[PDB]
Amino acid sequence: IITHVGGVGGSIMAPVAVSRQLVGSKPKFTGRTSGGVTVTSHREYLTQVNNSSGFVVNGGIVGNSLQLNPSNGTLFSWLPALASNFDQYSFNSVVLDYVPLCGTTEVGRVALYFDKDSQDPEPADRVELANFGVLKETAPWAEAMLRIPTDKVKRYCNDSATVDQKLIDLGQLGIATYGGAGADAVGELFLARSVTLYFPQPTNTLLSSKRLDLTGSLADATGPGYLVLTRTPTVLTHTFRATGTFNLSGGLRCLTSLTLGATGAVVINDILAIDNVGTASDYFLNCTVSSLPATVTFTVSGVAAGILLVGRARANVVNLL
Amino acid sequence: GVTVTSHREYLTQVNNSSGFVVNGGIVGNSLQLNPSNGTLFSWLPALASNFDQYSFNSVVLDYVPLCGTTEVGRVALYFDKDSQDPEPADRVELANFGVLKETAPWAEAMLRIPTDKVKRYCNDSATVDQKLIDLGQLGIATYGGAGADAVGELFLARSVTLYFPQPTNTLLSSKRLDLTGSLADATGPGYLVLTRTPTVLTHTFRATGTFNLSGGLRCLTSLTLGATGAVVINDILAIDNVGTASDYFLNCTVSSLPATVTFTVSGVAAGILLVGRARANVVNLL
Amino acid sequence: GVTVTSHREYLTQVNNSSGFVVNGGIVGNSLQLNPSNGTLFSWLPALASNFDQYSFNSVVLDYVPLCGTTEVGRVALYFDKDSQDPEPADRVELANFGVLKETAPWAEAMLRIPTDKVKRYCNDSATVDQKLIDLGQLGIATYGGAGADAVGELFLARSVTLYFPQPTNTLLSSKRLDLTGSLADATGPGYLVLTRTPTVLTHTFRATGTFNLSGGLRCLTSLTLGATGAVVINDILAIDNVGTASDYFLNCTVSSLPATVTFTVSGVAAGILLVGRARANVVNLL
Amino acid sequence: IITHVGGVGGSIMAPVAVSRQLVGSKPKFTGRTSGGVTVTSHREYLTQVNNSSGFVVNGGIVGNSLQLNPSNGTLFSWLPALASNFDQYSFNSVVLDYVPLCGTTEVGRVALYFDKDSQDPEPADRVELANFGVLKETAPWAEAMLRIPTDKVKRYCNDSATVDQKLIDLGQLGIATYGGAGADAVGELFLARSVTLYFPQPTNTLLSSKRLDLTGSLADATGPGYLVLTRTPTVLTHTFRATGTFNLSGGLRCLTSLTLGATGAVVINDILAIDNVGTASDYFLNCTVSSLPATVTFTVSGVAAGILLVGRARANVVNLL
Ligand SMILES: [Ca+2]
Ligand SMILES: [Ca+2]
Ligand SMILES: [Ca+2]
Ligand SMILES: [Ca+2]
Ligand SMILES: [Ca+2]
Ligand SMILES: [Ca+2]
Ligand SMILES: [Ca+2]
């Protein structure tokens, strides 16, 4: 069949393009009849690796997100709400898969790694990425793999909250691109799953609570974490980590009518915007992200207390009549 | 790619008290047995800084003695499993520890340490429950002396299993003082704290050996180089510009606590330095 | 009381040159396998620095791909048992070597390195017969390309046996320029050469990554910070005093050859610096 | 596996690129226990075929170099110094190998041939190259071969010298490129070796001696031949055929201080340059070629006698102190 030319048995072919074909990953639960507790193995997708001539990591996004715990609503788009009737998690297999949309003529580097410290900070440069134990180094166009070192320790989910994210999380996951020529798309990576659900509980809420200090930095958290809400002395920051349709509820301290800006992949849905000028205010809004960078920001003055809540929601109303 | 280390690192020179002193008659569980402890392990420092899980197999306290059969005191090495509990108050407390030893100063002593094989994490990301990650605490305690002179120099018998490797940590230290402030960033380890007082700096050692110092600061006012305690100055270079800020490189070599140094200056309105252990290495023009 | 090590370290980025080139067309058997070679081994940097003998078990060269199926060239990895013989002049010398591999640039390539079990010494005291101490030489060679762009990223398949425990071995580099002169001391390793020209400095990289730079010099004349090639400046701080000498701390991050930097100044009458690999770490006031 | 598209069994694939992978050729000697004389079979590389829109042959280089005798220091970079303890040569296999650095989109012709007359002159054009008995005709990007007709005649090496280069040499070797678009590189050719060493002698020196007549053309030779040293009425020519680090020794008749020029791949090493103006002069120099065209020339006047010697050498000194 195939006739390929200029080839004598034992020779190399670098083709114009390559592609694998990906299908319906329909999960299987297994009954580990135990404490009458469950086990799940399904395939959840994870992000579209775009290029970075320069040197970027999960989107140039920072605050080890990525985090291998399930939920990571940030990471795992389906497991979201099962390990949600449960309290202890434990994997058996997790494998990074890297397919490629681009073609044998893009010019760059992608790279998947694994840090056992859910908390150490991120890759600085070339020489650092490469020193990791569990790493892989691929041109972008060519097809790649990574399998992850799983213990069987009895590890806890984030339902109550826990600052030592390391003693509870399994690992960190990296994806890193340098040496590109443009920050376009070349890769879409997947997630090979297998998890052991344990002491199943009243089901935890997935709702987000995020306080800015009055002049300050940061008050409480509950998370998960889709959002960070910073202030700058005038003006807020609502910096997305998550994608989809959300629902936003809250307001803040200002005095000064709200001007609703945002930036990147964004589909505003319902912006409602009470103020009282002199005092504080409220915002409900409903938006829908499908990118990074998605940003939004409220524009205001004298941002002297920041409060919000975020808890994923449909094309759902959020405005008066 | 899992490395095993069994070495013998030096640790501190114990001075007496009449009174009742611990790990320097200093405080905040200094000695924590984790490697790094830049404070405790002067050698293991930048090996396990390429790794993420640590686990010992042997650790033994060794106590030799420089003094003579006529000093009058107590040395005492112990072991708290809670990297975090606070320190020895008095006589009756020190003695109640499981893994303790009670020796005169002149006489020669030992202690071996109870090691589990739990998969414990090193301090690259930070972790307030220093107990769930640290192996143990280490004590050394002296009461009943007659003078706070030196009688003992203690060592560290090592055996460690390094695991998942990625990125040496930072054998190199970065330490920012706010302009008027307190404290900017850190990278550490931490050998040094660099405080200011409104005039004048503080470089307060936690570490021992030959270092290398690089930096300068905001002042206006020529640098007068003082320091205090065990200290062997090596190279002090000292650019200023009076009116503005300045720079200091220097190379010194500590073998004590208390080692202090301080720069003397005025209007200390920004503090920056870096410290990353170094030899008898130059640090001055020609 | 000995160590063993098996990890994987990155090495340099193979660019292209239709000409015929060898390690960047730098010369003086740089790639030598010995560990340290700070130029070659970015990670083991600091284990074989606590040791005195070394011995490899595996060494494998790994060649992945930055370019694309239409890049147009030749790459080539080899191995000389004489840490000292000179480099490849042309195509025909390279091809005659025992341990060679010859690949497109675009396609992914391999090489295994031949290991003895001889008790070989590391470079702490110095040794002009670099051959009887070093295991082999490493080549990477590119000819017949069409542009001097990047095609390859080369790695290091490692497995090393450390023996008798040392007392550290500086990993902060010390590099003195004579007043009018050429060259004062060294400590090295060597990532950098610091030359002067009558006006102006040269900081010529041999190494890749995040460094930390500390020092200043003799001039009189405010500092203008240039550099050339793969370079990501991080923190440039720059005291001067005009009339006199000056200081520079800076933090940069190279991933190429050619990386250059140079300070621009006048009356370069003494050159001093130190360099000791460092993170994204601060190096400036506040 | 491979899925290649638009193909029904029996169809043709002309790929984006092809490459073979070449390794360490580590020679074997065989003991033909004879007159206690030796046999060698190893793989020596030979040149990088660059393109020639126009019509070029071993570099547009002329004076059948190329010559199949071993040594040919010009041709065989290793066999250089064994058939050097010997006096009779005889092959059994010699095969031209043509791999390719370029890609399936360069646009040209390469071509390997074989003339039984070590001495006939070179290919003029298209119609001439093709008429040879032992020739091969390849696009450049595609992968090629040629095997060579070996007799077993008892043929002599060039240790004493011999003007009928034909009665001693096995063959001529050609490589020819026409129809390009640029004189860049597409090919690197190799040499499949197998030689029978005979009456082994005191080992001959490899040193070159090259006399220009006073007004003339040409005095003696010893060779091998790496160099030709011509004059033009003013000025010399040192025209390389060889690559590497050499050592040059000599001077000449002029009167007129030496200006050292040269052209192409060249790394000058040590130029020393006595003159006496009025009279003659001397030059030692040490240079290092890795190309064709390498040229050098000395610039001078009244070039009334040319003498030199050349005998391959290291980064070795060649100047006073
Ligand atoms: Ca829980
Ligand atoms: Ca880590
Ligand atoms: Ca860590
Ligand atoms: Ca050699
Ligand atoms: Ca040594
Ligand atoms: Ca030693
Ligand atoms: Ca003969």
GROMACS .gro file of N, CA and C in nm, chain B residues 5-12 35 38 40-47 60 62 154-158 160 277, chain C residues 50 166 168:
model
   90
  326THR      N    1   2.236   0.937   5.145
  326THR     CA    2   2.337   1.035   5.188
  326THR      C    3   2.359   0.959   5.319
  327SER      N    4   2.484   0.946   5.357
  327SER     CA    5   2.504   0.924   5.518
  327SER      C    6   2.632   0.999   5.548
  328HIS      N    7   2.614   1.117   5.607
  328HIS     CA    8   2.730   1.202   5.638
  328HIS      C    9   2.714   1.261   5.786
  329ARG      N   10   2.820   1.331   5.823
  329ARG     CA   11   2.849   1.384   5.952
  329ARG      C   12   2.878   1.532   5.934
  330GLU      N   13   2.781   1.613   5.967
  330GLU     CA   14   2.788   1.760   5.963
  330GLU      C   15   2.798   1.821   6.103
  331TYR      N   16   2.886   1.917   6.117
  331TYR     CA   17   2.906   2.000   6.239
  331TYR      C   18   2.779   2.078   6.270
  332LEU      N   19   2.762   2.130   6.392
  332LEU     CA   20   2.637   2.191   6.431
  332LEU      C   21   2.637   2.311   6.520
  333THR      N   22   2.699   2.314   6.634
  333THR     CA   23   2.717   2.440   6.712
  333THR      C   24   2.820   2.420   6.822
  356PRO      N   25   1.576   1.843   5.642
  356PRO     CA   26   1.695   1.912   5.591
  356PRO      C   27   1.667   2.003   5.471
  359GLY      N   28   1.872   2.502   5.688
  359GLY     CA   29   1.985   2.592   5.660
  359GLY      C   30   2.048   2.631   5.793
  361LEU      N   31   2.025   2.436   6.091
  361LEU     CA   32   2.092   2.315   6.138
  361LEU      C   33   2.196   2.245   6.050
  362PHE      N   34   2.152   2.206   5.932
  362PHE     CA   35   2.238   2.130   5.836
  362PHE      C   36   2.313   2.218   5.738
  363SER      N   37   2.435   2.253   5.774
  363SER     CA   38   2.522   2.331   5.685
  363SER      C   39   2.576   2.268   5.556
  364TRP      N   40   2.552   2.139   5.542
  364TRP     CA   41   2.606   2.064   5.428
  364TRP      C   42   2.500   1.999   5.339
  365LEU      N   43   2.417   1.916   5.400
  365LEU     CA   44   2.289   1.878   5.339
  365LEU      C   45   2.198   1.985   5.280
  366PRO      N   46   2.220   2.108   5.321
  366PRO     CA   47   2.147   2.223   5.263
  366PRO      C   48   2.110   2.222   5.115
  367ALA      N   49   2.211   2.212   5.031
  367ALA     CA   50   2.193   2.234   4.887
  367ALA      C   51   2.210   2.102   4.811
  368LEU      N   52   2.152   1.997   4.866
  368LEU     CA   53   2.155   1.866   4.799
  368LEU      C   54   2.006   1.832   4.790
  381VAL      N   55   2.219   1.084   6.478
  381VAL     CA   56   2.280   1.053   6.608
  381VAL      C   57   2.338   1.190   6.644
  383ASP      N   58   2.622   1.380   6.848
  383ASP     CA   59   2.755   1.346   6.901
  383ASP      C   60   2.793   1.469   6.985
  475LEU      N   61   2.919   2.005   6.917
  475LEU     CA   62   2.830   1.895   6.899
  475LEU      C   63   2.832   1.874   6.747
  476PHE      N   64   2.820   1.748   6.712
  476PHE     CA   65   2.802   1.708   6.570
  476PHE      C   66   2.675   1.635   6.526
  477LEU      N   67   2.661   1.613   6.398
  477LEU     CA   68   2.543   1.554   6.336
  477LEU      C   69   2.564   1.435   6.244
  478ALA      N   70   2.540   1.317   6.299
  478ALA     CA   71   2.543   1.191   6.222
  478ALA      C   72   2.428   1.156   6.128
  479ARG      N   73   2.453   1.171   5.999
  479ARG     CA   74   2.343   1.169   5.901
  479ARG      C   75   2.320   1.045   5.815
  481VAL      N   76   2.025   1.003   5.501
  481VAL     CA   77   1.902   1.051   5.437
  481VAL      C   78   1.866   1.005   5.295
  598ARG      N   79   2.614   3.124   5.081
  598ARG     CA   80   2.738   3.063   5.125
  598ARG      C   81   2.854   3.045   5.026
  657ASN      N   82   3.038   1.818   4.706
  657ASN     CA   83   3.062   1.762   4.839
  657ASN      C   84   3.141   1.632   4.825
  773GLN      N   85   3.348   1.543   5.068
  773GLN     CA   86   3.416   1.675   5.085
  773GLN      C   87   3.363   1.775   5.188
  775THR      N   88   3.236   2.152   5.147
  775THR     CA   89   3.195   2.228   5.027
  775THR      C   90   3.298   2.266   4.921
   0.00000   0.00000   0.00000
